[PDB]
Symmetry: C3
Subunit: 33 residues, 3 copies
């Protein structure tokens, strides 16, 4: 259980990082995004 | 503890999925969003 | 392990909340965002 939860949490961290990059690009208009 | 953490993680997964949909809609201009 | 995972999950919750605010601001055009 705990090992599997470590994996889910790591995957969520990756998903959140990608969302943060995409949102910062929208907010700042980077490269015309 | 572990059971309660499973619930928090599942709820986060749902929140992240909704964020991903909203961000993809903004990035692509779907339906004028 | 479990204690450390509680911390990671709490930090993710905070990150997700901030993303939700930023995305709602983009979607609604609040304050010209």
């Amino acid at each position: 259980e705990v090992e599997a939860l470590e994996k889910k949490v790591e995957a969520l961290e990756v998903k959140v990082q990608k969302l943060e990059k995409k949102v910062e690009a929208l907010e700042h208009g980077w490269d015309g995004r």
